[PDB]
Amino acid sequence: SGERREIIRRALNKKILVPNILELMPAWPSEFQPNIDEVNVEIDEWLKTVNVAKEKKLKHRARGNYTLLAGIYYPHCRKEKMLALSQFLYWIFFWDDEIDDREGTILCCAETNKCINDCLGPEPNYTPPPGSRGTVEMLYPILRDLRAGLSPVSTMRLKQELHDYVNGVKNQQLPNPWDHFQMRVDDVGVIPSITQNEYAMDFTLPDWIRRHEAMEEIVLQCTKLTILLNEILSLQKEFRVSQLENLCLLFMNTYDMSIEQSIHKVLGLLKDHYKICIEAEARLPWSTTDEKLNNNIREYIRGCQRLATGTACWSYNCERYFKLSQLNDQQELLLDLSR
Ligand SMILES: [Mg+2]
């Protein structure tokens, strides 16, 4: 932790201009669900019922505005689907925030995993146990509404992915950068939002295509790309609260890279994984005859891409990570690791 102090020292008050990450994924457009505004109104009415601190809810609604993120993740869904999808993102940010006490983390993950089993398992019960904490209580109806619009095929995936997320977060309690990177792969809750594209677009991907090596690769690359652009876009926010386990800082620590080189290395990894992913599209088992099947493969991988581009584009349109003033007229971001 002299280790800590030296990272803090080597990056304090550094200012780093970041190129528009969207440009690094040039073939993948960002779009906006056209009913975001009417959904936020309903999301606003709904949040009044959520047993979370009004001031915590508003900070998330104002600076996070996760309905806008859902609208970028699922820009082509119908508005009726937007409600549950948005509700889901408020849950995962409230829950993730409520964690960031070993005893209390263990207890909360156990209750959350139980909620997931109770809602998405084979003997469903959508009634929260009495005394449930607010971030667990709210999840019960949200998983129920999502389950109502998924096939059991997609349901089963969302169940595992959520469990994986929860258990991942329970298991986070200076790491080698590659160690940090890989556990974020088998943790971060991007893959639940790939599966929720099935809910949004009212289709199911057959397991046999999902297990195909190109499809798995595409999911892994878009998960990796989401993590990588998030490592850069969140460096300011986490450095200021001395969350020093950020891939950039960890490249600084392990390899004695400058922060500039470190960010630059992350930007190259992005470019690498973006081309790996594009190449995987050629190896997908596209059908010669089945249009609907091929329309299902297309929407699925569009959800994968939109998760990387959407995470970036949303971050460029909300204040969760930096103040939007920090963007120049080229969507370039001046990080300011001042404190
Ligand atoms: Mg982050």
What's the chain's Rg over C-alpha atoms?
Answer: 20
In angstroms, rounded to a whole number, what is the distance separating the alpha carbons of residues 260 and 263?
5
- DSSP code for 327: B
- Specify the CATH number for the domain of residue 294: 1.10.600.10
Q: Are 191 and 158 in contact (CB under 8 A)?
A: no
What single letter denotes the amino acid at residue 220? L
Structure tokens at 218: 């595409």
- For residues 91 and 74, what is the distance between their CA atoms, to the nearest angstrom? 17
What torsion do the CA atoms of 206, 209, 211, 216 make, to the nearest 10 degrees? -120
Contact indicator for 309, 22 with CB cutoff of 8 Å: yes
d(CA 20, CA 270): 12
Give the whole-angstrom CA distance, residue 50 versus residue 317.
25
DSSP letters for 232-260: HHTHHHHHHTT---SHHHHHHHHH---HH
Task: Specify which residues 327 forms β-bridges with.
Answer: 333
Output the CA 231–ligand 1 centroid distance in Å: 6
- For Cα atoms 168, 174, 177, give the angle at the middle one, nearest 5 degrees: 70
CA of 185 to the centre of ligand 1 (A): 12
Q: Where are the alpha helices (DSSP H) in 121-242?
A: 134-137, 139-147, 152-170, 177-185, 190-200, 207-211, 213-233, 235-240
Q: Two tokens at 49?
A: 């019922």
Structure determined via: X-ray
Determine the structural domain holding residue 284 and report its residue range: 1-337
Residue 300 annotated as binding?
no
Closest C-alpha among 31, 36, 100, 90 to residue 63: 90
Q: Is 96 annotated as a binding residue?
A: yes
**Do 196 and 143 form a contact (C-beta atoms < 8 A)?**
no
Give 277 Cα–ligand 1 centroid separation in angstroms: 22
Q: 336 labelled as ligand-binding?
A: no
Q: Which residue has the tokens 């964690």?
A: 99
Give Cα separations from 231 to 51, 185, 188, 237, 324 (angstroms).
31, 12, 12, 10, 18
What Å resolution does this PDB entry report? 2.5
Task: Give the C-alpha separation, 89 to 67, whole Å.
Answer: 8
Which two tokens mark 160?
A: 């595992």
Q: Which of 185, 186, 326, 180 is nearest to 244 (CA)?
A: 180
The DSSP line for 34-45 is: TTHHHHHHHHHH
Give me the number of domains the chain comprises. Answer: 1
How far, in Å, are 140, 156, 300, 314 from residue 147 at the CA level?
11, 10, 18, 26
Structure tokens at 94: 């409230």
Query: Is beta strand 15-18 parallel, antiparallel or unpaired with respect to 333-336?
Result: antiparallel
- Distance linking the first and last C-alpha atoms of the chain: 19
- Tell me if 321 is assigned to a ligand binding site: yes
Measured in Å, residue 263 CA sits from the centre of ligand 1 at 14
Closest to 321 in 3D by CA, of 243, 239, 259, 236: 236
Neighbouring C-beta atoms of residue 49, cutoff 10 Å: 8
CA distance 203 to 99: 33
Q: Is 320 marked as binding a ligand?
A: yes
Of 64, 69, 16, 19, nearest to 308 by C-alpha is 69
Q: Please state, in angstroms and rounded to a whole number, the distance separating the CA atoms of residues 11 and 155.
A: 44
User: Distance from the CA of 234 to the center of ligand 1, in angstroms?
Assistant: 5
